């Protein structure tokens, strides 16, 4: 169940793709964009959980960017 609107997520994806391809035209299967968004979301969610065990670990209850950054740093 997707928490980001499909259209904002799709514009982004296209902008990103276009800033990489920079002129080479590619099509995206609707099922490619969808799979991507699942993965995009599912990554944010696990990343949020890990960063939150860090928060808790620091005695706090409010997620800080340093929680998210430590988590990423520990993932590699």
């Amino acid at each position: 169940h997707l928490l980001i609107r499909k259209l904002p997520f799709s514009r982004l994806a296209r902008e990103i793709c276009v800033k990489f391809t920079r002129g080479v035209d590619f099509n995206w299967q609707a099922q490619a964009l969808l799979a991507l968004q699942e993965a995009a979301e599912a990554f944010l969610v696990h990343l949020f959980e890990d960063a939150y065990l860090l928060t808790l670990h620091a005695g706090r209850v409010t997620l800080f960017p340093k929680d998210v950054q430590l988590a990423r740093r520990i993932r590699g």
């Binding site: 609107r5 080479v24 799979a35 800080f64 960017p65 998210v68």
Partner: protein, 67 residues
């Protein structure tokens, strides 16, 4: 564009992630995190698309880039 990922979406994602309260600065942080991830995956999906001589990014193409 990136500011098109909205504050409410970020909180739902965090909520689903079990986060209870969040700093105002999470919003822009979370956007930074997603721009980078999308750039990595997309660049790879497209590269494998291109490699196979196609011009249409598939769902196994994306799934490869995740791997």
């Amino acid at each position: 564009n990136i500011q098109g990922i909205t504050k409410p979406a970020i909180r739902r994602l965090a909520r689903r992630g079990g986060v209870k309260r969040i700093s105002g600065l999470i919003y822009e942080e979370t956007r930074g995190v997603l721009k980078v991830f999308l750039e990595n995956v997309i660049r790879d999906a497209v590269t494998y698309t291109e490699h196979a001589k196609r011009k249409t990014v598939t769902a196994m193409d994306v799934v490869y880039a995740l791997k």
